[PDB]
Amino acid sequence: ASRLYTLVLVLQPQRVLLGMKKRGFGAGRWNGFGGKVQEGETIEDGARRELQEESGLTVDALHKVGQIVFEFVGEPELMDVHVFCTDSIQGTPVESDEMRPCWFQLDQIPFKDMWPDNSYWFPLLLQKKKFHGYFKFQGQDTILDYTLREVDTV
């Protein structure tokens, strides 16, 4: 019923790393780094792998900060997105043909050019809160309804 995905936010005290996808799902939007979890792979190992494939960074310590389930009306698979944060990385972000990374100051996060759910849960992420969320989309631009709550354990 649901498919596992990861999303990694490289969040430092003054800035956050986002990437703009060149093509495919999410193209033309800034987002964190992530993707499908593979067979026999833990969710955390999948998050570390996707961070490297999409941004070129090697994460040292990762922390779980959220779980968000996405429903797209007319699509059978729910997306079960496990959200992680890190401030401890190695490397320089790599621009590839697939992905353009950019650092953003925290007061200049480009919410108008991000998925619309981000405006709801990034405020929690920036205050070091953990969360569970659900968003029902119709198409890629419209949130029909949602739930979002802070939690002590993800």
Swiss-Prot record:
Positions that bind O(6)-methyl-dGMP: T6, K21, N31, W115, P116, D117, N118
Outcome recorded upon mutating R149A: Reduces 2-oxo-dATPase and 8-oxo-dGTPase activities and increases thermolability
Protein name per Swiss-Prot or TrEMBL: Oxidized purine nucleoside triphosphate hydrolase
Effect of E150A: Reduces 2-oxo-dATPase and 8-oxo-dGTPase activities and increases thermolability
Highest taxon above the source species: Eukaryota
Binding site for 2-oxo-dATP: T6, N31, F33, G34, G35, K36, W115, P116, D117, N118
Chain residues that bind 8-oxo-dGTP: T6, K21, N31, F33, G34, G35, K36, W115, P116, D117, N118
Record note on what altering E54Y does: Loss of activity
Similarity comment text for this entry: Belongs to the Nudix hydrolase family.
Enzyme Commission (EC) number: 3.6.1.56, 3.6.1.-
Impact noted for substituting Q52P: Loss of activity
pH-dependence annotation: Optimum pH is 7.8-8.2 with 8-oxo-dGTP as substrate, and 8.0-8.5 with 2-oxo-dATP as substrate.
CC annotations in GO: cytoplasm; cytosol; mitochondrial matrix; mitochondrion; nucleus
Effect noted on mutating V37E: Loss of activity
Residues holding N(6)-methyl-AMP: T6, K21, W115, P116, D117, N118
UniProt keyword list: Cytoplasm, Hydrolase, Magnesium, Metal-binding, Mitochondrion, Nucleus, RNA-binding, Transit peptide
Tissue: Widely expressed with highest expression in thymus, testis, embryo and proliferating blood lymphocytes.
